[PDB]
Amino acid sequence: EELEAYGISDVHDIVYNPSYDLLYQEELDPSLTGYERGVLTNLGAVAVDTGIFTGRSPKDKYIVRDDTTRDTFWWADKGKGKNDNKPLSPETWQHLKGLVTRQLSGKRLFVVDAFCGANPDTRLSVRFITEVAWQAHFVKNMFIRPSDEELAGFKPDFIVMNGAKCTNPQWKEQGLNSENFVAFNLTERMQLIGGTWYGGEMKKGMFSMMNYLLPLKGIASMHCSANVGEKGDVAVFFGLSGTGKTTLSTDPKRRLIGDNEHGWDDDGVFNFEGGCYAKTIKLSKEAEPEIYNAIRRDALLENVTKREDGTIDFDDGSKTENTRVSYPIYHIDNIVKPVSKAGHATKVIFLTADAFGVLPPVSRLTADQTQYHFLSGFTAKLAGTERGITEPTPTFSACFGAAFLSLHPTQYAEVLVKRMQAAGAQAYLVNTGWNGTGKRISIKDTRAIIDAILNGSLDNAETFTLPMFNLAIPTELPGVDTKILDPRNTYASPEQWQEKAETLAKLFIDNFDKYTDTPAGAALVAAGPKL
C-alpha cells in the first residue's frame, strides 16, 4: 500500500529488508531465468551475471535541472570542464518515472531500507526498490544496515527505483544518449535506473547525492578508502578506478574504516558505506588474503567465470575485466566497529596508476602541490593491450572522482584543505602504476611504501627533487627496493624518461588551464610540472 505513494501499483508481494538467508534462497531458485539467476561457487558465495552492462554508464547519467539544482550543480553544459552531469527536463523525468513505476507494478518487489553515512546527524535514509533479488543483495551489502529499532521509525530521505528490465523507447525524441538511463531528481529526492542491471549505479548514485549535500555543509566528501593504526593515526587513500583503494587499505595490521566513500566533519573521518566492492580480475590469495577470505556465503560475485564443478576462474576476463565481489564490511576481521568512523586524518595519500611510466612510486607533496594534484586528478591506462602493442591514455578527473562530483571541483578542494590544515595533515603522491619496466609495481613494494608513509620513515628520509614535476623523492626507504624510488633508474638511459616526462607535463599543463581564471588557481600553476 505505501508503494502507491511512489507511483507503483498492484504489488501483491513486498519482500521488506530481506535477510541474508532469504536472499540466498531467492538467488538460487531453480526457476529463475536470464540475468536474475545466481549460481553457487565452491567458496560458498553466490555469483551472478550483470548482463550487457558490466560497469557504470556515465553517458546515460542525467540530473533534472529545476529551481532546486539550477544555480548549485556543476552542469555538463555550463561551467568550465568536462563532467557527466547532463541536464534533464522535468517533463522527460515524468516520462522516465512512468516507465520505471509501470515496470515495477504487479511484480514481487524487494524493498531495502538503509543508511548512507555513518553519523546520524548527516546520514541519508534511503529506500531501494527492485524486482531482482541479487540487486537487493548488492544494496544490503553496500549500504549501512539499520537495526530493528532504526527500521521502526524509518523515514526515507531518498528513493532509488531500479527498473533494470525496462528501457526508454522515446530516447531519440528526448535528446538522450540511449534507451538506458540513470536519472536524478533532487526536488523529488529520487534516482531512477532503466536498462542497466549493474549494481554500481545505485552505489555511485547515492555517493553523488552525498557529494552534493555535504560540502555545502562544511563537510568534506571524499572518493577514498581509509584506515586507522593501533596508535589512532588515520590515513585516507584517494584514487581513480583500479588504483588500489580497496587493495591497500585492507591491511591486517590496521583497522579498516572503509574502502571507497568517506566524509570528514568536525569529529573526523567516517564511512558512508556498509560494505566493500573489490576488483577480482587475476585475484591472488597470496597477495590479497583478507579480500580472498571475504569471499564466502553472503558475498556476491559479479561476472566471474564459474566452472561446471563450481570453482572460480579469477584470471578470466572474457566477459569483462571489471569482475567484482561485494561483501558486508564485517567479512574483514580487523575493522572499526560498531560504527565505521575515526578521528582526523593526518596522512592523505593520492594513488595514481601512471601508465606513462614517469611518476615516482612515492613523493611527499608541498601544500600547493596537494591542491594542484587534487584538482588535476591524474591517472592513465594501457588502452589497446588487446590490440597487441599499445600506448597510454590519460585521464584527468578532478578530486580523483569527477564522475561523482555534484559541485564544482574547487568546492571540494576548499573543504578538504580546511580539514587537512586543522589536523596538520600531510599529503603524498603514490604511483601504483607503471615505470620503465612496462610492468606495474608489485603489491608487495606498494605495501612497503605505504608502511613507510604511515610510520614516518618517509618524513625523516633524505630527499631530492625530481625534475620537471619538482617532486620530493626519498633516496632510500626501509623495505623498498632502492632502485625503483627514482623513476629514471627503470629506463635504459634517463633520456627515455625525459621524453615521456615532457609529454606528460604538457598534458598536465593543458589540463590545469581551466583552473587559472581565479587568482588562487593561477598561483597554483607554479606547483605544477614545468617545461
Which positions touch Mg ion (CB under 5 A)?
Answer: 246, 278
Residue 440 near ligand ATP by CB under 6 A: yes
Choosing from 242, 328, 357, 436, the residue that interacts with ligand ATP (CB under 6 A) is 242
Displacement of CA 426 from its chain's centroid (Å): 22
98 or 289: whose CB is closer to ligand ATP? 289
Q: Which is nearer to Mg ion, 275 or 521 (CB)?
A: 275
Q: How many residues bind ligand ATP (CB under 6 A)?
A: 20
R_g of the chain, CA atoms, integer Å: 23
Task: Pick from 303, 323, 340, 446 the residue near ligand ATP by CB under 6 A.
Answer: 446
DSSP β-bridge partners for residue 239 = 351
The yes or no reply on residue 278 touching ligand ATP (CB under 6 A) is yes
Q: Which is nearer to ligand ATP, 279 or 364 (CB)?
A: 279
In whole angstroms, give the CA distance from residue 486 to residue 359.
Answer: 9
Query: Cβ 290 to ligand ATP, closest distance in Å?
Result: 12
DSSP state of 365: P
Give the whole-angstrom CA distance, residue 220 versus residue 238.
Answer: 13
Q: Supply the DSSP string of 22-77, one letter for each residue.
A: HHHHHHT-TT--GGG-EEE-TTS-EEE--TT--S--GGGEEEE-STTTTTTS--TT
Residue 490's binding partner out of Ca ion, Mg ion, ligand ATP, none, with CB under 5 to 8 Å set by partner kind: none
From the list ligand ATP, Mg ion, Ca ion, none, partner contacted by residue 69 (C-beta under 5 to 8 A by kind): none
Residue 36: which of ligand ATP, Mg ion, Ca ion, none does it interact with, CB under 5 to 8 A by kind?
none
Is 246 a binder of ligand ATP (CB under 6 A)? Answer: yes
CB of 82 to ligand ATP, least distance (A): 20
Q: Does 245 bind ligand ATP (CB under 6 A)?
A: yes
Q: Which is nearer to Mg ion, 324 or 364 (CB)?
A: 324
Q: Measured from the CB atom, is 241 or 352 closer to Ca ion?
A: 241
The three-state DSSP-derived secondary structure of 150-214 is HHHCCCCCEEEEEECCCCCCCCHHHCCCCCCEEEEECCCCEEEEECCCCCHHHHHHHHHHHHHHH
To ligand ATP, the closest distance from the beta carbon of 249 in angstroms equals: 8
Phi first, then psi: what are they for 91, rounded to 5°? -65, -45
- Name which of 22 and 281 has its Cβ closer to ligand ATP: 281
Binding positions for ligand ATP, 413-432, rule CB under 6 A: 432
C-beta of 93 vs 396, nearer to Ca ion: 396
Residue 97 binds ligand ATP (CB under 6 A): no
Within 240-299, the residues that bind Ca ion by CB under 5 A are: 241
Q: Helix, strand, or coil here: 510?
A: helix
Of the two residues 47 and 358, which places its CB atom closer to Mg ion in the complex? 47
Residue 395 CB contacts under 8 Å (≥ 6 apart), including other chains: 240, 377, 378, 379, 380, 381
> How many CA within 13 A on the CB side of residue 119?
18
Determine, following the binding rule CB under 6 A, whether residue 244 of this chain makes contact with ligand ATP. yes
- How far is residue 47's CA from residue 292's CA, in Å, rounded to a whole number? 15
Helix axes of 20-27 and 133-142: crossing angle, nearest 10 degrees: 150
- Give the 3-state DSSP-derived string for 129-149, with helices as H, strands as E and coil as C: EECCHHHHHHHHHHCECCCHH
Tell me which stretch binds ligand ATP (CB under 6 A): 158-166, 236-244, 388-396, 460-468.
Answer: 236-244
Residue 281 found at the interface with ligand ATP (CB under 6 A): yes
Give DSSP secondary structure letters for 67-85.
TTTTTTS--TTTSSS--S-
Residues at the interface with ligand ATP (CB under 6 A): 239, 241-248, 259-260, 277-279, 281, 432, 440-441, 443, 446
